[PDB]
Amino acid sequence: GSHSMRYFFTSVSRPGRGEPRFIAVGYVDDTQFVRFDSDAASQRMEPRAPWIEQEGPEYWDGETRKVKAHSQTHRVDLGTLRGYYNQSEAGSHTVQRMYGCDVGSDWRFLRGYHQYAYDGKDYIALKEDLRSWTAADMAAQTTKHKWEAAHVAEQLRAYLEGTCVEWLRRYLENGKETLQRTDAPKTHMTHHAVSDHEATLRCWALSFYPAEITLTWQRDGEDQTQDTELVETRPAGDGTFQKWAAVVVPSGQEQRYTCHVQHEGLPKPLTLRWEP
């Protein structure tokens, strides 16, 4: 199937107590592989997967230099943005950046993206064509001027269609056992008395990778879309994800309900029956 690489950057200002906290993190699909924390004692881009650990010192030296440069530009960005919206010196502020590449099932470029936020709202986005910007703001248009003038869009599309996807592919092969292979969900159902008349049926999906999954409850075949509570898919800590879905049910009717599970790791969609 389709794969992706994405990098995420967060810088947050700290009025009084020194420089902004800069954190960077890189992902291939749902697996973290690098990190940088400007407050860590290493002051280095760090590995976070065994498969990137095999890269030599060239990689670690170089990446560190680029993430330090990312750190510095975002540090200045904080000052710039506080000016643009003429905000005070008090109060902490946040700049965020996300970019990366999607490859199709063929392993050839499919989509690229580069977005920026300020204090959690959209600021400026590189469009789809990779040649123009959505400056959905007022002050963002000041940033759009600088960037189409400096040919940032031109060299972004070169990164995105080029070295982004080429290194993704290197990552896909090096982490073959981790990134190209799936963990199928371990599924089960639990039952919880609510009252004498009502009860909760909960459908569990555990130790799955990737995170994309659908869990639905059906009654007599009909979907219970409205009445199903779904928690947010959550990480286990070991590279896998969890999710559950629940429905309140009248006592004595549990047998009419089935849980249905869709995930890449399953060769066909699962149908779990409460009472087979």
Partner: peptide
């Protein structure tokens, strides 16, 4: 890998 270089806003 990261993109090089990066621009301020």
């Amino acid at each position: 890998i990261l993109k090089e270089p990066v621009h301020g806003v």
